[model samples]
Target chain A: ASLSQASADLEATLRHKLTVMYSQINGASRALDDVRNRQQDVRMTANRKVEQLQQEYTEMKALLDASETTSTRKIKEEEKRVNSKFDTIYQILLKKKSEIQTLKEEIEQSLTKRDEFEFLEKASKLRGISTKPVYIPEVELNHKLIKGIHQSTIDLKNELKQCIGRLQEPTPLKAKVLETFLAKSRPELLEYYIKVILDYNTAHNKVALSECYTVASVAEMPQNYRPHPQRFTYCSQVLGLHCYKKGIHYWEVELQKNNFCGVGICYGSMNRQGPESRLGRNSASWCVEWFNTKISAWHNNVEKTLPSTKATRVGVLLNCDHGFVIFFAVADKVHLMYKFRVDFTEALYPAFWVFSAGATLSICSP
Target chain B: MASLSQASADLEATLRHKLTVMYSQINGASRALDDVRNRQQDVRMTANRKVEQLQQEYTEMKALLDASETTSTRKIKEEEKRVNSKFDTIYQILLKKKSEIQTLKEEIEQSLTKRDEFEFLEKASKLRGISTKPVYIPEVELNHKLIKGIHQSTIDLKNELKQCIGRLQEPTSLKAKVLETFLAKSRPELLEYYIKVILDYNTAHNKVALSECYTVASVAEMPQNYRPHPQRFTYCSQVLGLHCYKKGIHYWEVELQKNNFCGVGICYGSMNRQGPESRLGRNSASWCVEWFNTKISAWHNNVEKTLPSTKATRVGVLLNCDHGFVIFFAVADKVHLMYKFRVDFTEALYPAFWVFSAGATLSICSP
Candidate 1:
């Protein structure tokens, strides 16, 4: 038999197999849906039951309230306490597990950052610069965070897992029908949250910050421009206009042409003039820099040579609350270049460095 | 103020019993409601796990498939494309399940607020009149306006959900998608009858695992100790139900997991119990799909015939008992009949399984 024919045959077989399996999955999903429908109907009917009883009580209440005894007051008070407790509990644990939402944000932002880095790396590679292997320690360590996110996903499921079990346990006046209407799922709680734009006023004389601050890079022609104290005097660099003090934030930078470029986060306190103004060369700034094919992490004027990925695109994850800044080279998957743990007291802004005239950095839209 | 105070005490006394009743009810609901929510999460995790399996499978399969020039590359790529299409379908199925779960979640969550905002119970502002005595105890009840709204909403959502349930029980969207899509302007159906398969445990041999639901099957890691009739076939970890069909238009579906190392078909009840006599497709009494990994063939009466490789995870068997014949189909988004047998049976035949390896799994479809 022609191997290609055999191949085609095998392919058809697999496809047919998958189709049936999928159909079964569809059936199972329908079964699950049926279970939920029945469960919902049960709750709604229970509401009917509750209302039936409630009507009876409310009907008599006008007279009863007119004739309350001393002990009845205590009973009414107890009911108040119980109802209040129930609402409070729902608000706390059942509302939205903050950790779950935070975890989701981290997962999404990290993934987005990876995409940006990969774009940068790919673009940089097309330039045909001298390639040197940037030293990176752990493809293992790089995945550790992703793995942790997966683990936390399990953790959230467990958290939710506890919720339904508690419902099954016998409780008088339990919130049975409550599951009928309002919704709760942890991951859906994720909201898109990062916004990045450049501080054009802080751009160096040789840096061209254009495209509504989305594009940042070195310029070919000299600029007849006014200088500001916040602008870089000796380095082609720009800072993000807004600063973040406490929260998880991530953004990606795509290097259109590679060679010498740096993407980093720096505090407002970082030097803005002379040789100190360049990213990764001062006390307050942290970045992953690329010179040709080599990658390095620098801060406080000290350079940490790290493993290389020609990743022109870079993803920066800044956990201001945690006091750490991590830079990544994004491709099919994210590779960690380096991380710096610093007790950041002031708000930090996104910062950049362009040593090569051809390097153009654009902040990704998402 | 003194007269009002005496009236308040009387009203409290009357409300105590009802208030307690309300508490008990709400508590029960809150917890059970909690359960429905948890089950959704649990279900999601399971579905997610399978997708993970398919994903891992793809990665493992990639090394063997990473080319396009040679037969190895072409076939592997073909296989890859098919598997991806399958994986994509699986993902969408998962997504649908997830959506259904979320919808259920909201319904249950709605109850929390409805019960919490017990306003009629709170119209204490209605407590101002009385002569320290109950007067003209007018006949009254909880507002049906509220009850009616609850009823309407309940009915509406139920109708919405009923719209959801209407798909499956309506003679099946699934098999319809599978068989009808591929089957040529088809011949016929045993529409008058629906025969479902349930694994018979009493006659099922040991070293075989039947799930608690009597559907999913796999190899038992530990052994099953029992008083055996010593006459039953024990080779190759196969199990059988002693139901042999002699009449009616009977049809059934079975799902195969792990595409490798399992067999599904039927055999005579009187077939060999032990040694080689019991092996499916190795004996005359049994006819079955024999999977030796990449090798696939059909066997009956100990005569093996080579067949094209199949990736089908589910198979449908249509037996026209009245016609003295049976047909096997690679049930897909459409049914593709692979082989058929014409045999006049002297006695009844039993549905059988032969599974090997931990990955091997088969479930009797709830057809």
Candidate 2:
């Protein structure tokens, strides 16, 4: 009975092991199907690229052929044109070749990764017996395995097939062929390309700062006091443009004031006497009037009231003729009750308050 | 024999049980010891606080005493003097009374703290099992039991002690002494403190930005035709200072010219002289002469001989003259000559080469 019991236990254990192994095999099959689908996707993507390249080559060849047939040329001239056309075609061919080379290299890397994954799968199967029942080793999901198969085998086959098809398409080696066809049939498109290249070259170079002068003002004046408002606006515009174009943020205006003092002293009088005034006397009259009117007005009303009202107004005023007078008054008091007037043509005047009627009048009369 | 064996087994079991209980009790005792130590620390802290309070009270009372001695004397003297002095004395006495009240408040706080500390010490001693053997329980520790006694008994004693101290200290009367003292001496200190408060207030409330003007140019002509030479350190210094002070990164200069037409027009001669020999005529002659000399020199020495050069020389000379005739001559394959002549006013005739000859003669004649 004990032997029978032991055999039953052993059998049960063996059955459980078989079930686990079957499950693992099912999982592996699913993984393999997923990898195959990924490979098919990569192959399709590569085939699309090859087909696009073929179409471009065919179009370019047809254009060259059409140009050669229509353009009038001698045999030698045609041959030279054909050679130039061939050169351009050759450049395009070389670019394609380089792209294909890069694709090949990528395929090779993918193949290497796939080979590694396959080897790992084989090893995992071999070592399955010793692995713990509770602990399943995690599978690494590597993209390289599928990408490698597509590039190294399937992509190359597809590219080869596309190349064979492209070879059947006639390629013309005429330089003028493309040019003639474009000029006669695609004027707008040709103009568009020409404009694009011209714009590209123009934008590629740096623009220089232009040195330009703008007449800001017609007359000499302080910038702040410039009478012509438009001059300020013009100057500001120029300055703004300079800053925007050259990043130069500073500007200066040099002032040449020709006879500024002379103008200030004589301009009004010259205007008053009209244009026919004699030179020397006119200038003298202008100066006298400026002094008597404009300059004297500044002092008369304002300077007179200051001394009377200000307590600290101790400043003495003496006429150029050497006549002198002293007037004293308190700050708030308006009347000058005390006054001393002296004919100080050769002497000094003493302090005085000159508030009496006719006191200033008497002094001036003297 | 069976009884003996059974008893031996029971004894062993009992021994193991007792050992486990002893281990647990030991852990409990350790924890309780820690708790008792913490309570003792609290008691010590309370004592320290009580002492500090008492010291503060003592200090306040002393201050009050000093204040009372001053203001009270002032009051007593005033009362013994005239009627006006009587009012002054009353003010001084009132001030003294206020300071005394402040002193009394401090004393009350101090006495309360001292009472609390005394009660805490009593409680701590009781918790330490000073009067009884420690009782053992399953969870309760001997040390905890002792500390619980101290925490409870001391708290109750502290309250009663505080009340007793409060009554004996006469807290209110002491307060009067402190108030009188503070009133007499505290006015100047209070005044200084209040003034500081005002100054800080003003500082916090009032702030402004000051405006200033800066002059850029020195009393010398700028170098490089007013281009601001790189080596003109003073100009740069003024510019930099202005930029930093105004927090601006750029500046500009405006040029003003007088008596020159901006576009195409004749500038009036100086003083509007109409005569040929007047100051206006002389001024025009001087300007033309200077411009002619400069143009001639530039043509002779520096300018490259080319088609453009010939055209520029002709333009310059003709532009200089009121009526002078100027011509350009190609003297060699590469050399160019500018010929210009002004008519002699005396004869109304002068050869082309004779003009320069006459100009040279006049230059010599100036001496």
Candidate 3:
């Protein structure tokens, strides 16, 4: 073989190769060691981070659950306390209402058991005068709430129903009786149209209760009142103070001149707001209306038409014995306008609604 | 300086031509060894994970079983026994594979371990009460020739200059690393000085077995009412090589199969004829490799240092008689080191072996 010049270069290069390789080997070994160490640290840190988060989340969840349970329990406890207090007030109202019932029952029991006066004066006076027999019925308290605290069970029950009605939440537990007041039906109930006092709280802001709250009328300026929960939110209507559940007491409501108004009676529990508050809409109310030139009687949102007879005055006849109410157009002789044969489940009250100005209502001796 | 003749010119070509073959062989072994290392890691991770899973499952099952009724626990225990037996077999397999991988690793590492080559050349020589000179390696540096003072010239040795210039890049360092490995001069020198060794019949036990070829040896078949041999090594199926050494460097090799419960070492005739001290490497006269299944240890004077295991088949022994040191290696594509011992020799030394397992075998090879 010829001495190739390439072989000389190869030999020289191979010689230096030894030293360079040693350096590279050492370098690679050291670098790989560092990378692996750093990798170990990173893995450890990541593991710790996850464990820390898990611990934090577990504690936070436990606290939140406990707090929620405590708040719910507190709310339920407070509710129980408030409901307990409500029952007591309801009981007090119940007692006031039941007085009327007990008294009425007492009166019925005394129908033959009375020893006082015994009507001895009228027959004795007439007998002394030697006049022919003259008959005049004894006047007595017939309405609810004004019976000096011992009103009939019927008045108390309707009031109880109203009291119960007030407690409901839109009640999401969520409507009642016939009479013992007149077992022998009182046909002459026209005498029981007692003088009605207007309630300032129950009167709509557009209604004015005047003449010592004896009558109600429409006004241009609304009346201001301390707000009452039971206060009417709509309608120009007012409820009468005295509601009757028994007896015969009569009075009249005569409209002022050229009045377009409504005149009749309803349950005291009749809605104080809404269209039902307009004397006659819901079953809780009844009324006769004089709208412009038309005459109609309304109840339960139903309208009944009548022969329009012009009268300067109207007489209302409530016969407690039969659970019936009659509205009459009274001129010289009273003509029956419309009659109601309700199985009255509640104490009935006189309610007035005025839609026009220039008319004030008055209480007249019937 | 010895002036070179024209033969020196051909010398570079021959070195390169031979290097091409070396590089080719190096590439294959490097690839195989690297693949073995990766497989070893994978095997270890998978096996460890499987074992961990089994342990965890067993713990959980044990907890559940502990919580149950006595009758159920009793039944579970019975089931556990059968499963345990199965796992014991699997455990044996895992250990077997690990030894094979270890042996392969040691073999491969023997090639890649720059430390091994350097150590051989450094050739530490220490004897009892004797100080000897250590081996030496020369420094390598660059002799860069720049191109004609920064300009081109087709000068003498143009090819040589081109080769040096090409070596300026990153791969230049790679070539150096390759060459350093290529100059495995010490290993070849060790392989050259071989001493023929055969089993000594006088030292062999009755239970000892030897093949017809005179090279292979194993444990003999078990006998009924066996007669214990006291004059010879019997307890460990022990035997000795035929020749004894008094001076000068000598080298030899023994090939082994892929099994254990065997040992290889050197012993003095002054050793006891009976008892533990009589065992090679248990006495002051001996230094040896003891292989009990997967574990490999180098024992000297009853002292043991456990080493990461190997599956090398051929063993190499390099005896530096005057230097008073001996080095053992597993001969393969690259020589793998087994152990080493240094002592002042006052008497002759013999090659000895002890094998307990019936299936294990060892064969002495030619130089």
Best by lDDT: 1
lDDT of candidate 1?
0.55
- Residue A228 displacement in candidate 3 (angstroms): 99
- Residue-by-residue lDDT tens digits, candidate 2, A75-181: 22433433333333333233333433443343334334333434333332322121100110111222353233223333323433343333323211233333332
lDDT string for model 3 (A237-342, tens) is: 7776566887544556777653478888887556576655666678788888877857889888888876788675776667565567767676666566787776
How far in Å is the alpha carbon of A142 misplaced in model 3? 99
Candidate 3, residues B185-287: lDDT per residue as tens digits? 3667666677767664445766777543245678778632223333366454778775668787788888777557888778775676576657777777888
Comparing only chain B with the true structure, the TM-scores of all models are 0.48, 0.19, 0.47
Local accuracy of candidate 1 as per-residue lDDT tens digits, A1-366: 454454444445434444444554456566545444544544454455555544433333322222223223333343344343333333333322332243334333433433343433333322221111111111011224334433433433343234323322322111332221113221221132365776545788788765434687788896635655666788788887567897777777898776888888888767688776778776788787888857788877787787767666677776665566666666545666776656788888888888788888888654
Which of the predicted structures, 1 or 3, would earn the higher lDDT when compared with the native? 1
* Regions of model 1 farther than 4 Å from truth: A1-366, B1-193
Q: Cα lDDT of all candidates, in order? A: 0.55, 0.25, 0.54
Worst 10 residues of 2 chain A by lDDT: A195-204
User: Measured against the native two-chain assembly using Cα atoms, what DockQ does each of the candidate structures obtain, in the order listed?
Assistant: 0.01, 0.00, 0.00
How high is the lDDT of residue B51 in model 1?
A: 39
User: TM-score: which candidate is best?
Assistant: 1
Q: Count steric clashes of candidate 1.
A: 68
